[PDB]
Amino acid sequence: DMYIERAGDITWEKDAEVTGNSPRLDVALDESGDFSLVE
Amino acid sequence: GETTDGVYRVMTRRLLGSTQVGVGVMQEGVFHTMWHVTKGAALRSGEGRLDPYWGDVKQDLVSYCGPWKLDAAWDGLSEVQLLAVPPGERAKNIQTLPGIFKTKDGDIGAVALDYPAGTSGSPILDKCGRVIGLYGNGVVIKNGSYVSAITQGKRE
Numbered sequence: 001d002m003y004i005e006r007a008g009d010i011t012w013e014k015d016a017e018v019t020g021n022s023p024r025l026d027v028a029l030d031e032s033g034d035f036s037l038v039e
Numbered sequence: 040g041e042t043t044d045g046v047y048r049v050m051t052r053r054l055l056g057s058t059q060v061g062v063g064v065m066q067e068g069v070f071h072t073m074w075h076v077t078k079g080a081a082l083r084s085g086e087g088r089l090d091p092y093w094g095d096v097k098q099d100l101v102s103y104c105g106p107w108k109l110d111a112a113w114d115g116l117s118e119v120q121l122l123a124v125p126p127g128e129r130a131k132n133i134q135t136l137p138g139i140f141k142t143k144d145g146d147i148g149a150v151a152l153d154y155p156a157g158t159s160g161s162p163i164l165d166k167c168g169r170v171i172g173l174y175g176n177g178v179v180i181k182n183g184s185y186v187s188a189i190t191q192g193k194r195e
């Protein structure tokens with residue numbers, strides 16, 4: 001049996017840690033819901 | 040049990056201790072999470088039970104107690120916030136500019152942030168606080184890093 005526990009509110013927070021790049025990737029989604037890179 | 044709107048941890052006791060297997064959003068009495076988190080199994084919320092209502096393996100999404108309620112979309116230009124709820128760690132908002140998963144059926148937003156697999160289902164937000172999708176289904180790029188799609192469902 002799985003159970004849920006509250007972790008917080010859903011709000012936009014100003015001055016949050018800004019990180020991560022923005023790559024453009026050629027992908028494919030299969031019938032099992034798994035993404036793969038197309039090359 | 041607790042049906043207050045917000046972000047929640049999805050825990051399991053089947054394994055050692057209490058392990059976090061994913062995250063979800065409670066909105067308008069509906070719990071929204073990734074399919075690979077629960078496999079469509081029932082959830083507990085204190086003494087109350089939550090039953091699956093809609094689910095799809097290909098989309099990798101599942102809703103409990105009602106139909107999928109989240110319908111905000113990424114505008115394709117602005118930065119977003121991943122409200123990452125990692126196992127054993129406090130919820131933190133990480134601001135990022137998404138990339139693009141180019142597919143044969145159209146382009147989809149993508150957040151290039153690495154978090155443990157149990158962070159799956161954490162919401163991605165717009166500047167208005169609206170849930171534009173869930174984090175946890177994507178690809179592993181050349182250096183072992185994870186790039187997740189911005190996964191959103193359809194509001195019927």
Ligand SMILES: CC(C)c1nc2c(C(=O)Nc3cccc(CN)c3)cccc2[nH]1
Pocket residue numbers: 032033034035075099153154155156157158159174175176177179183184185
């Ligand atoms: C690469 C690794 C560190 C990592 N894996 C992940 C995953 C992950 O493996 N998700 C997953 C698993 C099973 C099935 C599906 C749906 N087809 C998605 C989710 C979030 C962050 C991650 N970081």
